[PDB]
């Protein structure tokens, strides 16, 4: 029975509407859900706008009047020009009339702000359509009627605020360039009268609500108005004094002054400089006397969250950082301004102590800006030495674990601050260390934080001072561990000690006997059952190895052999208690060291010894699993095999080209294992169905296949002898993987095969033309069929497929020329198919392939293949590109659609397509492609956007083709088209903007 109002045959039941609306807003359950689906239908009715004056006049429900203004807004924004003129003035006069009525009823003006603001916004939508050409005295009467009522004057500020936003802040992609410029110029011309009324209100008081509405509109003007309105009036004095005192105006005034600290002003006038100094002085004075003194605990204030204190401290941080980043040089020379400058930074110091991550990032950005200046600019750092001394403590005590970005920012600032005064930084950190030892600040979080800070300044002190500093820190950290009882605590300190030593490789490199002691201590930590210790020991080991590898490769004085030999020799004892992933890190660490040995015979010997255990385990299973493959369903055997391959991956990751000898030791049996594993996967899908791909036994088998492919791609991606890759590796690889992929059911096809093939083509693709053809024949059509029925299934194959086509089109384009015409047509279909993805991985590759393919066809010249390509597929690409440009569901790819489209258009207006793009009958002979291209596009757009006039389509196409050498202008013309198709009756002259 609620479905009643949906019938427009009868008259609207206003009382039924107010019930439907009240059920939706104040109701619940299916009752509310039912009212929801009928209010949308009433609103989405194309004729509902004619009933809107009933509701705004008859209804008793403010939400109903809101909804009807919404229906009106859709009318004004998209069909205003299609209306018979006389209704355009009825709607218009009705809205200002309704606004006038609501402003004189003090009851309505105070208790229906939602409805008034929505009405004010609806009026502004009308002004965008009609002003000033069809309403040239709006601004003179708006200013005249402000003298009438305080409620009208304040509401007019709401209208002006919203107007400024729609014209200058939110116009860039909501209107065409021409209409935006028209409205900006119009407001620019009449602003002198707007500023007179705004300044009068600000000086003459006295209603706070009127004052705040005037300041909120002033915030918007400051985005665009010329500087003279701010510096050549008294307005900076009242913002920086009168309006900073009252808490009603404080918040908005602060934001205005923050915008002023960004205005475009000449940097040579000495009056404007003193004005920039003066309003900062007044503002800080009001804050010291009316809000809080410079010594106040802003951290406690922020945590108590009384009133709007959090928003004020946030706005004050934004104000200080903005002003001081731009103008602090004005305050550094004059001695009378020294207290002003230092007080301002002392507030920032107090702001920096607030427990509020996002606020801290805002102040940290400014500190970074500051300390970098004191590091590079002469004669500045002595001004801020007490500020800097406090900043060192703030950052040391708020050091985060190394989010990713915050730590890097904290490190950079703290490193600058240590350069500016090494001695003060060193004294803060020992002191904090002492207060950890005596227990006054001892905490797991406080000792970890301090260790991160101490580790972060590495390499900033002299090697001598650093040596003395590290010895003191390690000494006292070792004593802190000694003194604590219980390993829950002893682990915490032992981890911090290891993190610190890992941060100081210059120290470790100069004291070998100490370096060896660290490594040997990490090894006994690799047997520690306590959780986290083993992980810590492995991470520190590889960290130290990366920075000190050379000291493991040489034989150290008073030793009998390079320490790498000692590590390898006891590797089984050392790694005996580790988890498999930890063993792989250890082997990876050893591979880093071995790569330092540049004598080939010695490097290969270390590789052989490192790989001894995995090669012995490998040789065993290769024999027994070939004899014969029942073991490969034992879940223990597949785990050992997978872990053998991962160990090879880990070592190959750090050794790269030097890994080739170990790859040769296992390559042919590994590819055989790949074949055997592929058989049992296939046999298991046959015996149990597609569900078998989810079982543990098959998932362990697919892990072997994936690790084998990952090993091969790891080596090939880093190989330097490309000839051995082509002559020894590529052939047995393709035989092992291509046919297995092609002849598996889709749910058993490893997308990693495509990724591996991508790596092959990327590195040696220019040397294997028959190899690339074989890859296309085995994977192209069968993978395309997996992914061309929807946009969701097989997401990995989708991405790897188009990465593979991308690199093939870049490196071995000849493979696409040897495709049969039907296969080539599927290639073109697959490219356009990628246009239509919202998946940005797929979509970006798809547009890039199309652009690269066009350039491939261009470089062929005047050849039968190039001619037929344009005959068959030029207009497909032009129309498919237009489709994703204009359908509103692929906006993320606008820039690359525009690029591809201009490349297509510029081909025709440069006569690079030598063959006519039409068939002989449809157009008179001798007609240029340019003429036919305009006719095809005009017909295409006319059918696709029938509400466009012919003159719109012709103006747009004329501008678009004339601008196909200027992307920036071209992209603006497309954005203008995208606006005009959202409405009816767009101005065709808008396309002359450029």
């Amino acid at each position: 029975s609620m479905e009643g109002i949906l019938d427009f045959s009868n008259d609207l039941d206003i009382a039924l509407l107010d019930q439907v609306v009240s059920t939706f807003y104040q109701g619940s359950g299916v009752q509310q859900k039912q009212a929801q689906e009928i209010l949308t239908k009433f609103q989405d009715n194309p004729d509902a706008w004619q009933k809107a004056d009933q509701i705004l006049q008859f209804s008793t429900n403010p939400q109903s009047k809101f909804i009807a203004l919404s229906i009106l807004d859709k009318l004004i924004t998209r069909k205003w020009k299609l209306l018979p003129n006389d209704h355009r003035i009825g709607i218009r006069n009705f809205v200002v009339g309704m606004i006038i009525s609501m402003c004189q009823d003090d009851e309505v003006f105070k208790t229906q702000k939602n409805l008034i603001n929505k009405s004010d916004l609806t009026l502004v939508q009308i002004l965008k359509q009609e002003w000033p050409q069809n309403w040239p005295e709006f601004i003179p009467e708006l200013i005249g009627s402000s003298s009438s009522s305080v409620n009208v004057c304040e509401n007019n500020m709401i209208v002006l605020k919203l107007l400024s936003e729609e014209v200058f802040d939110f116009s860039a992609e909501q209107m065409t360039q021409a209409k935006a410029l028209h409205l900006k110029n119009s407001m620019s011309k009449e602003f002198e009268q707007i500023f007179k009324l705004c300044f009068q209100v600000l000086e003459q008081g006295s209603s706070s609500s009127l004052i705040v509405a005037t300041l909120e509109s002033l915030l918007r003007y400051l985005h665009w108005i010329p500087y003279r309105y701010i510096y050549e009036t008294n307005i900076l004095e009242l913002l920086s004094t009168k309006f900073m005192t009252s808490p009603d105006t404080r918040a908005i005034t602060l934001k205005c002054l923050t915008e002023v600290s960004n205005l475009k002003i000449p940097q040579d006038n000495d009056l404007i400089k003193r004005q920039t100094v003066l309003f900062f002085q007044n503002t800080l004075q009001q804050i010291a006397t009316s809000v809080m003194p410079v010594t106040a605990d802003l951290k406690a204030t922020y945590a108590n969250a009384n009133g709007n204190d959090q928003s004020f401290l946030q706005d004050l941080a934004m104000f200080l950082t903005t002003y001081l980043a731009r103008n602090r040089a004005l305050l550094e020379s004059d001695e009378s301004l020294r207290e002003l400058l230092l007080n301002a930074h002392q507030y920032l110091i107090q702001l920096s102590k607030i427990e509020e991550r996002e606020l801290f990032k805002t102040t940290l950005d400014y500190w970074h800006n500051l300390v970098a200046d004191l590091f590079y600019e002469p004669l500045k750092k002595h001004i801020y030495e007490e500020i800097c001394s406090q900043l060192r403590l703030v950052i040391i005590e708020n050091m985060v674990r190394p989010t990713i970005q915050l730590y890097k920012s904290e490190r950079e600032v703290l490193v600058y601050l240590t350069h500016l005064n090494v001695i003060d930084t060193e004294e803060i950190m020992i002191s904090k260390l002492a207060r950890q030892i005596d227990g006054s600040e001892w905490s797991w979080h406080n000792i970890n934080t301090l260790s991160w800070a101490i580790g972060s300044i590495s390499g900033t002190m002299s090697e001598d001072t650093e040596k003395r500093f590290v010895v003191t820190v390690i000494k006292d950290l070792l004593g802190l561990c000694e003194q604590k009882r219980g390993k829950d605590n002893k682990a915490v300190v032992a981890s911090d000690i290891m993190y610190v030593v890992g941060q100081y490789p210059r120290f470790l490199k100069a004291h070998w006997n100490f370096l060896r002691t660290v490594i040997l201590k990490l090894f006994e930590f690799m047997h520690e059952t306590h959780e986290g210790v083993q992980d810590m020991a492995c991470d520190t080991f590889i960290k130290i190895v990366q920075k000190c590898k050379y000291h493991f490769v040489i034989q150290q004085p008073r030793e009998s052999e390079p320490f790498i030999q000692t590590i390898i020799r006891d590797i089984q004892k050392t790694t005996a208690d580790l988890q498999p992933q930890q063993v792989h890190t250890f082997y990876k660490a050893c591979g880093i060291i071995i790569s330092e040995e540049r004598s080939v015979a010695e490097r290969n010997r270390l590789l052989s010894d490192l790989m001894q255990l995995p090669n012995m385990a490998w040789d065993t299973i290769v024999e027994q699993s070939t004899a014969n493959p029942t073991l490969l369903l034992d879940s223990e055997t597949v785990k050992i095999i997978a872990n053998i391959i991962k160990t090879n991956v880990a070592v190959c990751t750090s050794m790269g080209a030097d890994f080739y000898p170990q790859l040769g030791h296992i390559y042919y049996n590994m590819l055989q294992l790949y074949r055997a594993v592929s058989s049992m996967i296939s046999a298991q899908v046959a015996a149990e169905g597609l569900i078998a791909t989810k079982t543990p036994k098959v998932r362990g088998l697919r892990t072997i296949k994936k690790e084998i492919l990952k090993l091969v791609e790891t080596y090939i991606s880093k190989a330097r002898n490309l000839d051995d890759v082509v002559k020894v590796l590529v052939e047995p690889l393709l035989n092992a993987v291509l046919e297995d992929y092609m002849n598996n059911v889709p749910d058993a096809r490893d997308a990693e095969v495509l990724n591996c093939m991508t790596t092959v083509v990327e590195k040696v693709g220019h040397m294997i033309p028959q190899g690339v053809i074989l890859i296309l024949q085995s994977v192209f059509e069968c993978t395309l069929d997996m992914i061309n029925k929807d946009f969701t299934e097989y997401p990995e194959h989708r991405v790897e497929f188009y990465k593979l086509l991308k690199v093939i089109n870049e490196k071995s384009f000849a493979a696409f020329l040897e495709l049969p015409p039907a296969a080539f047509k599927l290639f073109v279909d697959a490219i356009c198919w990628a246009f239509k993805h919202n998946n940005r991985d797929v979509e970006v590759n798809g547009l890039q392939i199309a652009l690269d393919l066009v350039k491939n066809i261009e470089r062929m010249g005047n050849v039968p293949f190039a001619n037929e390509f344009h005959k068959n597929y030029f207009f497909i690409f032009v129309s498919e590109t237009f489709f994703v440009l204009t359908d509103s569901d692929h906006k993320s790819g606008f820039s690359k659609q525009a690029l591809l489209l201009m490349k297509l258009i510029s081909l025709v207006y440069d006569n690079k397509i030598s063959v006519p793009l039409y068939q002989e009958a449809e157009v008179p002979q001798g007609t240029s492609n340019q003429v036919y291209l305009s006719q095809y596009l005009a017909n295409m757009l006319s059918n696709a956007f029938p509400h466009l006039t012919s003159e719109q389509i012709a103006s747009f196409l004329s501008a678009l083709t004339k601008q196909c050498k200027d992307l920036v202008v071209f992209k603006g013309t497309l954005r203008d088209f995208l606006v005009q198709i959202k409405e009816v009756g767009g101005d065709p002259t808008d396309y002359l903007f450029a």
Binding site: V471, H511, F514, T517, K521
Partner: peptide, 16 residues
């Protein structure tokens, strides 16, 4: 202090 530091580190054990 470096030879002392060496000995203190080798004595670090988590189970006393």
């Amino acid at each position: 202090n470096l030879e002392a530091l060496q000995k203190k580190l080798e004595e670090l054990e988590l189970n006393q």
